[PDB]
Each structure stands twice: as C-alpha cells, then as structure tokens.
C-alpha cells in the first residue's frame, strides 16, 4: 500500500539523520566497509538497515 | 551478440527457439517479469476520494 | 476470443486458414444441451433464474460422434468462441485447418448428406443475432461449394427470406469477392457505448459479455499488435500486403 | 551495479509515483485510460538511467 | 435376518465432473483468498471509520468500484463462484461458466491450486449395516454419534454383527451397560464399557443378553486430504448458507445436515476416491462463499 | 390427541430493555475490541520476555497501572460489562450503570456499533407442537439435534402432524427407517430416508405404520443478523462462564444449555423480533466477557 511505503521511507530518513548527527552511533570501521563500493557512508547504512 | 549470429539468420525464429538458443550458450535472462501492484488511496478532504 | 474479433470476410477467412481443427473441438466434458435449468443470478433476483442450455453458449458441451457433430462444433466455435467434446477424431483430421475441412476434398471427410435445415435448427438460429447468422451462412456457403450443392444453398435461402437479406455475397473460389465484401462480422470489439462489469440474465448474454470484457483486457494487454507503433517488427511472411491471397483462391 | 542501485532507490521512486497520481482528479484519469502510446528510448539513455 | 443402516449413507448422488482441472482449482483458491481479505477489510473499515480499506478490497474482488444506488453483490466473481458450486454438488447441475472467465479470475492472485497439502479429521460415524436375528430389534440414530438400541425378546442370547466399512480409521464404542464384542472366529473377552476398533479388522459380533435394552454410542474419526487453507468451521457455515440460499435445489439429489455427512457418504460409494476429490474442492468454494456473503449481506 | 413440545421453547422470559441504544452498543463493541487486545498483549508479553505490551493494554482497559500487590480485575470497564450482562438477560435486573459512565467508555476506541452488517447460522431445531392421535406415544429429545420417537399401538396407520414454526429457514429430517411425509392436502410420496422442508410451507403429516418404533432426527438452520465481530465459539464459551459466575441468577427466569437455544427460544415467543436485537447485543457482550476473564481470572 502507498501509505505503508510512504510511512517507512519517512521513518527511515528520520532515523538515519538522527544516528549521523553529533558523534555518529556507527563506527568509522563499518562505514569503510559500506563505502568500499563508492556509495556514501550515510546511504550505505540506510540500505543495510532496510 | 552472444551466439555470434546475424539478424537475418535469426529473423524467422520464434520466442521458444530464441530462448533455447540463449540458454544453451548459458544466458538465463530470457524472461519477462510481472510487476507487483501497489494499492493507493487519495484522502477525501473537500472532495470524494479516489 | 480471437475468432470473434474478426470484422471482415478477409480477416475471418485468413484466421480460419491459420488455425487448426483442434481449436474448434474442446476436451472438457461439459453438460448436455436442450436441457431446462435453473441458474443463479443474484445481482437481479433472489430466486433461481430459469434458462435453457444450447449449443450456442460459450461453454463446452457434449457432442455427437459423427460428421454432423463435427460441423456443428466448427460453426459453434465461429459464432460463439467455444466448441464441443468430440474426442478420438484422429490426428490426421485435427492437424488440418478449419478452412480446409470446410472447402477441401483432400481431407477425407464426407459432408454431402448434411442438411442445412436441422443444422440451423440444432444450432439454434432463432436465438442468434445478425452477426452470428452471417458467420453461419458463410460456413454453409463454403460447405455447399465444397460438395457442389450451390443449387441447394440457393433454394434454402429462398425459403427463408430474412437469411437471404443478410446473406454475405462472395464466391468461395474467388479472392476478388472477399476483398470487395464490406460486411461487419465482429461479435467483440472496442465499444463506443459504456461497457460495465455487470452480469446478464441469459446464459448466452452472460458468456458473450465475458468475451467482450475479455477482449478489452486483451486489447490493452501486451499480446495485442499495434500496427502504428511496431509495423517494422513483424516478419515479412505475416506482414499485411495487398498481393496476399488465400491459398488456392 | 544496476541491481544494487535498483534495490537502494526503489522507495524514492515508489513515493514519486504516488505523489504524481495524487495530482490527477478522477474524471481526468478515466479519460486518460482510453488513450494509448509507445515510448521509444535510446539504448544509451536506458542503461545510463539505471 | 433384519438389516439396519445409517440414514445418511443411503444412495449418495453423483457429483460434478466439471471445473476440476488445474486452472479451475486455482480459481477457487483465489476466490477463498480474496474473500478472506474482504472480511478483514470490512473489519478494518469499521474500527477505522473509513470506507477506503473496504473499497480497495471490493475493487480487487469485483473488478469494479462500489457506487451508491447499486447493490454490492460481488460482481462477476460472485456469479461464477455460485454457479460453480452448484455444478460440483450434482451431475444434473448445468455448466454455464466459460473457460475464459475462469482463467481471468484465476490470474487475479498468485496462489497454488494444490488441494492435498494437509489433512482434516471428520467425525461422521459410518454404519454400513447391522444384521440381527429374528427375535431382536435394532434401531440406529444419529450421524455425529450413532446410538444403536438393541432389544432381545427371545429366550437365548443373540449375536448381532456390525459393519463399519473400510474408510474410517478408528471407531470407539461405549455402552450403557458392559457388553461383549469380538471379531469373527475370536473368543469373547470379559464385559467392558468401551472398545476401540479398527474397521478394517472385519465384522464385529456383539452378544445381546435377554432383558433390558443395550445402547451403544459410536464415535468415528476419518482423515481426508484438504488444502492448507481449509477451515472446517467456515465450510459448515457455507454449507448451511448454500442450502438456505436455495442453490442445492437440483433434481434427484440427496440432502445432508452438514458437510461432514456429505463427504463421508460420497466416500462410502463406488469410485469413492474420485468423488472425494471433487467434494474437497466444493468445500473450499463453500468457504469462499461464506466469507463473501458475510462481508456483503442482504436482508 | 396429545401434544409434544421441545423443552427449550417453553415460556421464554422477557429480556432487558436497557443498554440497547447507539451509545450502549458502541460501548459493547469497544469492550470487545479492547478485550481482544488484552489477550493478544498477554501472548506478546510471554513471547518477548517483557511486561511492556501487557502494561499498555491493561492501562488502556482499566485506566490504571497494574500493581503486583493489587489484584487485576479490569477496573470500571469490567464492572460495567458485568452489570450490563445481567441487565440484558432479564427485565428484573437492576440496570444500575450510569449513562455518563457508558459514554466515557465508548469514547476509548472508534467503532460503529452496528449490529446488522453480518449474519450467523444458529442450529437449534424448533418443534412447536407435535399432534398425535390416541394409542400413540411421541417423545422429543434434544435441541441441537432433535430425535422424535414415535410408537403406534392402534389397529391402523396413524397421521402425526409436525409444526416447525414460521422462523426457521430449512429443516432436514432423517429417519431410522424410510417413511412417508407430505404437506396438508397433498398426496403422500414413496417412503424415503430424508426430507428437506421449509417451515413456512405448513404443517407436515407423517404416516406411522403399526410395528417397530420410528425415530426421526431433525436438524434446522436459522439466519440471524449479527455484527461482523461476532464469533460463535467465543459467545458460547462466554455464556457458560456467565452462568457459572452467577450473572443470570435472577428470580423468575428460564435457563438454557447454550446461547443458541436462548436466542431461538426468544425468537419464537409472541413478537419475537422485539427480543432478537437485544439477544445479539448480549452475545457480543458475552464475547468480550470471555476474553477479559480468560486474560484476568478472578
């Protein structure tokens, strides 16, 4: 349903923006693992969380 | 491209023959994939909804 | 559904040449015709709606294992979209086209003794519409010229005036007549009116409506051939050419 | 690469389609269902998009 | 010798032989799935005070949008399902649903049409025959639990033979007073209150001493392969709705108090294996019919 | 002439006339919804090794946090549901739940309170009267499946009249031996094992031959409008609990072994339509009472 998809996408962005503010919750080591393909570390974490 | 043939040679070939030719060479992408349908609702507000 | 969409003598005859006889017959046992039945039509009534089963409905029905039954199944397929249940005919006959069965002596079927009166009576002609009658008269004309019974065909038409008025005008051996003919033989098509997803009381009308709504779905699906967009993708054998003519005509 | 991007960015495009259809009134949509067309895309554009 | 038998096992009428292929079973499977979603959406609409969830579910089911002043009856899918249910019940029922309609509705959802994933337990007790000597009276009453009342009027003890067929897996016999039961050409044990019997063992002989009547309560359980979506509670309700709606009123047919008796009676007939396959499909269709009718009611 | 009547159809007591308005119906629907959530929350708490799901559900239902020392009763919503059940059963019940309490409890969840959007099938067989001539014995046993035992002792065959009321939809009769039954002023058919009848058709005559007794087993189905949340499995269990808990212990009332017999008996009284609507509301209340008490035993 469109409502469920819209709700999931908005919540995913709210979580991602929160966990990357101030000192990130996620360490620099795994950001390196997820960036190795060239994508942004923030985008890679969003994909992995989904 | 894959079986090293020209367009005129395979001109009078059915979908079954083309699929068989490609699978023998080792190409598995010979199928069409149906798309799932997402139900969408527009809230009424000041007009009947859709 | 494909047979019912043909709108001209050229398209209908071309389709019959391509299709084999196995499409005309069905392998589902069905029920028997000429039986008074009570069917459920809940959108209109709470009780059971009476009706009578016939050979013209789009549902498969048991048929007689003779040449008479085979011809009735072919005409039923043309005018209704489904045939009857006549099994163990033989692979020699089932491979040949519907047109070849109707107008060629090489098949081996003997149809000279067939009478058009009972065939029209059995394939209920008082319940057909104008388009259905025209297709049946085409089949009768093709059969008559196959066995050299043109005189009998004319006398039968002269007995029934309304059939003569709507009888298609074409000689089965000449291709110029098929080209010139401008009869409308389409039973399904894109409707100018408003077609809804509702049931009809009669068995014939409900099945016909199902084919009509089915054609709309098929028309808008990916299996339809849009000539204005992909005319260069069809093969040269099946491309539309004015020089094209039916085999032996 | 095409598969990874498609799985990464399907949520954004699903929301986009929902928003665009929200802009169309009902009477316009039923009228537009009568029309049909085929769109031609250059092979370079299709691959570059994905 | 006098003979008695269960009332519901007498003359099982033939069942339909149409819409039993892969496509048709897929259509019935799709109908059950979409009917279930129709019931759920009606609940979601009611707890949410919005008609949107119900409208969307009805649109999938009926391929049309609900409109006021037009009664919501389910559309073409309801029409096809009702007429197909009639065809399954009897061989005299007409087949009036075209194949292009079955294929179109089967494609509405992607579900398997296999009807043998799981099993179910049916409680009807089959008593094929009970033979008694001249000076005895035997009466058989009931289908979910059979009460066999036996009276001995003669001087000597009587021997009464029981036949339970070969389909039931277990039969449990309980008596008002302790009684003796043993297989043919077997010694008779001490009088007991209960017996557990496998019907394939053979005819069972029960001694009936002269005096007060002896009543035996029979309970049987049989296993029939059914689809994993099969729900017995919904099927029984659908069976009663179909009977009340009047779509089981065909010529020369038998009527049953439940779907339990219907399926067991067809099982205890010649070519009973083939009849059970058709009856299972009719059971799932009755499940779809029940859910659809409750979601969209009439007065 | 002798008369035989089903035991459960004799003298139905008047039902309560309170708590049947739109506000009260909404409260019953709210109670069922929250009671169902109470059961699911207990299962979730057990599976998740936490008490957070159950604390939220109990707080919404009872308007108070659970406490280890205090007993879990359900709060005011339990008391209101218990009291309306007593009021539904009999007209002599106190009916002492204020209107303000009901309105505040119906505002917790959003429900329509419509008790006419679905139907359910009730299997009690109504046998209003069986008329038998002299030298004949007739006995009726059962309510879900009725067995009519008939014995003829006269010289010739006897005519026995069956009256199944005018409410039941269909009746199916299966005899121990083949027998003859026909409507009034109609020829009798050949002996048959089964008969399907409409009670509206009229009284039915059964020919009883001289000899062994004839037993007729009766099964009936009736359709009654119920809410979409109606569940017969839960309603019947709740009916037994309320009887065990003494909610129906009122003076000058009848008693029934199941909810199916209760609703059919009230249907067949003089102007039975007046009571069916109230009986259906009681059933939905008994559904909520079952789920609440099983989650919170007392």
mmCIF file of C-alpha atoms in Angstrom, chain C residues 5 7 11 31 38 41 49 103 117 120 124 129 131 134 136 138-139 160 175 182 191-192 214 230 232 248:
data_model
loop_
_atom_site.group_PDB
_atom_site.id
_atom_site.type_symbol
_atom_site.label_atom_id
_atom_site.label_comp_id
_atom_site.label_asym_id
_atom_site.label_seq_id
_atom_site.Cartn_x
_atom_site.Cartn_y
_atom_site.Cartn_z
ATOM 1 C CA UNK C 5 -12.776 -10.230 -33.079
ATOM 2 C CA UNK C 7 -14.634 -7.919 -38.532
ATOM 3 C CA UNK C 11 -9.703 -11.406 -41.634
ATOM 4 C CA UNK C 31 -23.010 -30.832 -19.931
ATOM 5 C CA UNK C 38 -32.254 -23.112 -13.017
ATOM 6 C CA UNK C 41 -28.426 -14.600 -10.992
ATOM 7 C CA UNK C 49 -33.429 -17.757 -12.979
ATOM 8 C CA UNK C 103 -13.814 -26.338 -48.508
ATOM 9 C CA UNK C 117 -32.444 -27.232 -42.033
ATOM 10 C CA UNK C 120 -29.706 -24.420 -38.363
ATOM 11 C CA UNK C 124 -30.483 -22.575 -32.653
ATOM 12 C CA UNK C 129 -28.071 -12.264 -33.744
ATOM 13 C CA UNK C 131 -23.525 -11.190 -36.838
ATOM 14 C CA UNK C 134 -23.829 -14.125 -41.175
ATOM 15 C CA UNK C 136 -23.154 -19.434 -40.116
ATOM 16 C CA UNK C 138 -20.524 -18.264 -44.571
ATOM 17 C CA UNK C 139 -19.878 -21.791 -43.298
ATOM 18 C CA UNK C 160 -36.034 -18.233 -45.550
ATOM 19 C CA UNK C 175 -10.392 -13.791 -53.900
ATOM 20 C CA UNK C 182 -17.855 -4.990 -46.645
ATOM 21 C CA UNK C 191 -17.338 -0.475 -27.638
ATOM 22 C CA UNK C 192 -18.489 3.049 -28.427
ATOM 23 C CA UNK C 214 -12.077 -10.209 -22.060
ATOM 24 C CA UNK C 230 5.647 -1.728 -34.383
ATOM 25 C CA UNK C 232 8.597 -2.902 -38.805
ATOM 26 C CA UNK C 248 -5.950 -21.990 -53.717
#
